UniProtKB/Swiss-Prot annotation, chain A:
Family: Belongs to the cation channel sperm-associated (TC 1.A.1.19) family.
Phenotypic consequence of gene deletion: Mice are normal but males are sterile. Male sterility is due to defects in sperm motility unability to fertilize intact eggs.
Originating organism: Mus musculus
Protein name: Cation channel sperm-associated protein 3
Leader sequence residues: none
GO BP terms, alphabetized: establishment of localization in cell; flagellated sperm motility; sodium ion transport; sperm capacitation
Keyword set includes Membrane: yes
Assembly: Component of the CatSper complex or CatSpermasome composed of the core pore-forming members CATSPER1, CATSPER2, CATSPER3 and CATSPER4 as well as auxiliary members CATSPERB, CATSPERG2, CATSPERD, CATSPERE, CATSPERZ, C2CD6/CATSPERT, SLCO6C1, TMEM249, TMEM262 and EFCAB9. HSPA1 may be an additional auxiliary complex member. The core complex members CATSPER1, CATSPER2, CATSPER3 and CATSPER4 form a heterotetrameric channel.
Intramembrane segments: 68-87
Gene for this chain: Catsper3
Annotated compartments: Cell projection, Cilium, Flagellum membrane
UniProt keyword list: Calcium, Calcium channel, Calcium transport, Cell membrane, Cell projection, Cilium, Developmental protein, Differentiation, Flagellum, Ion channel, Ion transport, Membrane, Spermatogenesis, Transmembrane, Transmembrane helix, Transport, Voltage-gated channel
Tissue expression notes: Testis-specific.
From Swiss-Prot, chain B:
Family: Belongs to the CATSPERG family.
Stated role: Auxiliary component of the CatSper complex, a complex involved in sperm cell hyperactivation. Sperm cell hyperactivation is needed for sperm motility which is essential late in the preparation of sperm for fertilization.
Domain of life, source organism: Eukaryota
The gene coding this protein: Catsperg2
Protein name: Cation channel sperm-associated auxiliary subunit gamma 2
Note: Catsperg2 is absent in sperm from mice lacking Catsper1, suggesting that stable expression requires Catsper1.
UniProt note on tissues of expression: Testis-specific. Specifically expressed in the principal piece of the sperm tail (at protein level). Expressed in spermatocytes and spermatids within the seminiferous tubule but not in interstitial cells.
Whole-protein coverage range: 690 to 738 of 1145
Subcellular location: Cell projection, Cilium, Flagellum membrane
Subunit structure: Component of the CatSper complex or CatSpermasome composed of the core pore-forming members CATSPER1, CATSPER2, CATSPER3 and CATSPER4 as well as auxiliary members CATSPERB, CATSPERG2, CATSPERD, CATSPERE, CATSPERZ, C2CD6/CATSPERT, SLCO6C1, TMEM249, TMEM262 and EFCAB9. HSPA1 may be an additional auxiliary complex member. The core complex members CATSPER1, CATSPER2, CATSPER3 and CATSPER4 form a heterotetrameric channel.
UniProtKB/Swiss-Prot annotation, chain D:
Name by which UniProt lists this protein: Cation channel sperm-associated protein 4
Disulfide bonding pattern of the chain: none
Expression across tissues: Testis-specific.
Subcellular location as annotated: Cell projection, Cilium, Flagellum membrane
UniProtKB/Swiss-Prot annotation, chain E:
Function: Auxiliary component of the CatSper complex, a complex involved in sperm cell hyperactivation. Sperm cell hyperactivation is needed for sperm motility which is essential late in the preparation of sperm for fertilization.
Gene: Catsperb
Glycosylation sites: 27
Protein name, UniProt field: Cation channel sperm-associated auxiliary subunit beta
Top-level taxon: Eukaryota
Annotated compartments: Cell projection, Cilium, Flagellum membrane
Note: CatSperb is absent in sperm from mice lacking CatSper1, suggesting that stable expression of CatSperb protein requires CatSper1.
Assembly, per entry: Component of the CatSper complex or CatSpermasome composed of the core pore-forming members CATSPER1, CATSPER2, CATSPER3 and CATSPER4 as well as auxiliary members CATSPERB, CATSPERG2, CATSPERD, CATSPERE, CATSPERZ, C2CD6/CATSPERT, SLCO6C1, TMEM249, TMEM262 and EFCAB9. HSPA1 may be an additional auxiliary complex member. The core complex members CATSPER1, CATSPER2, CATSPER3 and CATSPER4 form a heterotetrameric channel.
Length: 111, 49, 198, 200, 48, 251
């Protein structure tokens, strides 16, 4: 596939398109850094809210990589229903409010 | 003569129903009685009645 | 009682008692469908088994509050329970096909769909005004018999007891009366306002 | 496994970052309390260091869920200072006054259509349509529009042919699609307005 | 402490002048750097 | 009592419509939002419907006043047409409850569902007539700039309607005797095409259609999904963005 990328390295029209879209690299890097900062903030928040109590909800707000992936899914639209059905049974009523607040900030702001 | 009430109730046992909250103080009253301190030395138990 | 509570919970997804909870007395909801269960206990033995069969139910009296109940005559019970009565006096109607001899009263079992309560215009549900807050409550004294629907008992277990209900909305005129009196008084007031504003 | 030989070093670096933060706050205070109090972000930094210092010195139930997010909030505040994120951050806060009216209109329409919602809700197809707050948040879930076929199967099989399974479902489906489209459009519209402001 | 030793604890803790615990749920937490020497006894009158 | 009655009705209608209608509709809204409220209706169910009938009598008095009022220009207002429609269903269900007897099913039936949704747009019209004051100019301008481009969005929704109907026809045609049990009729068909248009378990459709013997229906669904998604969402986003963009270019 890298060889195929070297193939598509031709086509001066696509080169001009790449040049025309190449000034947004710093902007998309800045938006990615803001995204990552928000994932880190809500990663430590979700850990402190659900994984330190250690009464369930493991590998969703527990281990770091699984927690990060669940947060990325919650920032997207996918998996939110089943994640909510997983978290509402852990005697944490305000977890639903926290998760819908997290959605209405992260998903809308990012997209 | 009183357990002819028309309701089903839990497991019938009228002595158990009137005991109720006092079924959890068996050893409590036993310790109070054993050292000869509780009341006039009178002890009432479960299975007698 | 406990089987009735949990069956109402499973069927209607809810079960509401009175504002004053009673341990022996459960307040059944009028909106919730009622499915009666009964059991025969042999108190001289350690045996108490559910009644897996048919039984006869008929309301024999109604009361607003405590000791305000009276028994009903045979013609009264015929009006209030027998589907043959064309007069709108029926208290309940169950979508069942089984009926006793002479087609007098409905016969229902443990497998029956349930009891649907009506208490139509001739019943004392109509013209009900509680004297205080909260929906009015009612008690219905009734007997369950096994007189002619048994092939395995030598005598019937004729049991008389009371069923509670709350939330009674049964009438009509009163709503019309309050509606027309409100319309008449408000149009009189508005016409007075118009004439005195001119 | 890392913590058992790092907890004392974690405590020392906590003390070091707390004392350098309060030293920076004191240095800012030196120029004047009035100018530091009348600022848009120094108020946030002062609140951050005040909460952290009170939870450190005085006994508090604030614990890890306050100590760590306050540190990463300070991280965000410091990383805002360097230039190639400050322009982007400045216009996110410029977009929220124009976003707030969109949120208000969305929630008002959400309520006045939930009055239509709660009519076919309550005591039937329950546990997501009842309680009048769970119903609102479940309609919000369905408006966010992902995996609502659990709800579709939940209110499925009323009569198996039409019932209200036609009527209520099409009413709420067209409401969901209209609200989702309008909300997403209004969000990107407020974003494009405020950034047109930042390039103007 | 369930609703089984409430009356025991409320009767005993006055005249023994010491806290009274319930077994089968006892756990300890120590904040020290030394030797801790603990003794466990059973309340009088319940054994010979 | 002709034109003189009309001008007396105009002046006294201004006065009594400012005074009486506002307070009674506010009280109707208060009792209706305390009514819907499926936790306090059991703390009620007897003081609730009597007040419903009383305030519906007040509403039919409003209807009687509007009928005796100037007439044709009152009918010329679409909101007043909605009011007349609501009063028509209100008197219909009121007399239906009043006559009693009858011969159809009752005790919380589908007709009763139709009645309480009737009370739902009654509450909506109460909310609409309570906001005569302080609609707030910021969201007023926002709503006007929303409603500025009506023909474009109506054309786009007409196009999406035609495209969904075509996709529904072709998919129902190609899925014959291919377990239609999820979409055996036109309603469930168009609902499945709504799910396919709203990104809801169409991957599940792919995985449970691979269990069937048909495989080429998956690329067809695939290309249809992606083209209608990109075209429709991009068209609506672009149209509304530019519509607010000329408003931004102006003052």
């Amino acid at each position: 596939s890298l060889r195929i990328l070297k193939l598509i390295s031709y086509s001066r029209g696509i080169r001009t398109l790449i040049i025309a879209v190449g000034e947004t690299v710093y902007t998309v890097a800045s938006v990615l850094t803001l995204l990552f900062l928000l994932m880190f903030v809500f990663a430590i928040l979700g850990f402190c809210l659900f994984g330190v109590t250690d009464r369930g909800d493991l590998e969703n707000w527990g281990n770091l990589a699984s927690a990060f992936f669940t947060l990325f899914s919650l920032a997207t639209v996918d998996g939110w229903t089943d994640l909510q059905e997983e978290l509402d049974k852990r005697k944490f009523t305000v977890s639903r409010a926290f998760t819908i607040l997290f959605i209405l900030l992260a998903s809308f702001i990012f997209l | 003569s009183k357990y002819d009430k028309p309701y089903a109730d839990p497991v019938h046992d009228p002595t158990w129903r009137w005991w109720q909250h006092k079924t959890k103080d068996k050893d409590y009253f036993f310790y109070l009685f054993s050292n000869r301190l509780a009341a006039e030395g009178i002890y009432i138990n479960m299975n007698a009645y | 009682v406990s089987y009735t509570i949990m069956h109402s919970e499973e069927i209607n997804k809810h079960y509401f008692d009175c504002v004053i909870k009673d341990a022996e007395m459960p307040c059944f909801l009028f909106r919730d469908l009622f499915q009666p269960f009964f059991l025969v206990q042999d108190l001289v033995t350690g045996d108490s088994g559910s009644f897996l069969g048919s039984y006869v139910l008929k309301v024999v009296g109604g009361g607003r509050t405590l000791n305000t109940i009276r028994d009903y005559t045979e013609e009264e019970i015929f009006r209030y329970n027998s589907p043959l009565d064309t007069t709108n006096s029926l208290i309940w109607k169950t979508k069942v096909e089984r009926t006793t001899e002479d087609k007098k009263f409905y016969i229902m079992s443990h497998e029956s769909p349930g009891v649907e309560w009506l208490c139509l215009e001739n019943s004392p549900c109509y013209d009900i005004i509680p004297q205080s807050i909260y929906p009015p409550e009612f008690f219905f004294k009734l007997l369950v018999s096994n007189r002619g629907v048994d092939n395995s008992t030598y005598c019937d277990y004729k049991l008389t007891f009371i069923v509670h209900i709350h939330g009674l909305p049964l009438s009509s005129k009163r709503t019309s009366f309050i509606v027309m009196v409100s319309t008449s008084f408000f149009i009189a007031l508005v016409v007075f306002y118009i004439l005195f504003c001119l | 496994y890392l913590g058992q030989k790092h907890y004392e070093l974690f405590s020392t670096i906590d003390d070091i970052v707390l004392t350098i933060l309060i030293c920076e706050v004191l240095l800012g205070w030196l120029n004047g309390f009035w100018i530091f109090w009348k600022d848009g972000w120094n108020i946030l930094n002062f609140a951050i260091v005040f909460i952290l210092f009170m939870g450190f010195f005085i006994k508090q139930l604030d614990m890890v869920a306050i100590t760590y997010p306050l540190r990463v909030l300070r991280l965000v505040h410091v990383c805002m200072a360097v230039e190639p994120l400050a322009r982007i951050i400045k216009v996110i806060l410029q977009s929220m006054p124009d976003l707030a009216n969109v949120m208000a209109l969305i929630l008002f329409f959400m309520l006045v259509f939930s009055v239509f919602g709660v009519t076919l809700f309550g005591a039937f197809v329950p546990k997501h349509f009842q309680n009048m707050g769970v119903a609102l948040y479940t309609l919000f879930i369905c408006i966010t529009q992902d995996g609502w076929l659990d709800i579709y199967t939940d209110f499925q099989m009323d009569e198996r042919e039409y019932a209200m399974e036609v009527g209520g479902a099409i009413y709420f489906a067209v409401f969901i699609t209209l609200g989702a489209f309008i909300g997403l459009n209004l969000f990107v519209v407020v974003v494009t307005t405020n950034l047109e402001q930042m390039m103007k | 402490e369930p609703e089984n030793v409430k009356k025991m604890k409320h009767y005993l803790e006055p005249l023994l002048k010491t806290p009274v615990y319930n077994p089968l749920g006892l756990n300890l937490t120590i904040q020290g750097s030394e030797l801790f020497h603990f003794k466990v006894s059973v309340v009088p009158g319940v054994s010979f | 009592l002709l034109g003189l009655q009309q001008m007396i009705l105009s002046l006294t209608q201004s006065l009594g419509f400012e005074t009486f209608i506002f307070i009674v509709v506010c009280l109707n809204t208060v009792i209706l939002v305390a009514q819907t409220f499926t936790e306090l209706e059991i703390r009620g169910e007897w003081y609730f419907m009597v007040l419903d009938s009383i305030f519906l009598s007040i509403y039919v008095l409003e209807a009687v006043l509007k009928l005796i009022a100037l007439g044709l220009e009152y009918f010329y207002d679409p909101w007043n047409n909605l009011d007349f429609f609501i009063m028509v269903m209100a008197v219909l269900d009121f007399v239906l409850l009043q006559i009693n007897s009858l011969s159809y099913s009752f005790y919380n039936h589908s007709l009763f569902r139709i009645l309480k949704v009737f009370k739902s747009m009654r509450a909506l019209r109460a909310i609409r007539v309570l906001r005569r004051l302080s609609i707030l100019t910021s969201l007023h301008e926002v709503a006007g700039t929303l409603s500025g481009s009506l023909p474009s969005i109506t054309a786009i929704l007409t196009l999406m309607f035609t495209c969904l109907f075509l996709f529904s026809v072709v998919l129902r045609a190609l899925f014959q005797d291919s377990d239609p049990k999820r979409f055996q009729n036109i309603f469930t068909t168009l609902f499945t095409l709504f799910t396919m248009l709203t990104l809801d378990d169409w991957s599940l459709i792919y995985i449970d259609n691979r269990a069937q013997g048909a495989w080429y229906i998956i690329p067809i669904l695939m290309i249809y999904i992606v083209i209608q998604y990109f075209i429709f969402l991009n068209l609506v986003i672009a149209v509304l963005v530019d519509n607010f963009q000329m408003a931004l270019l102006k003052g």
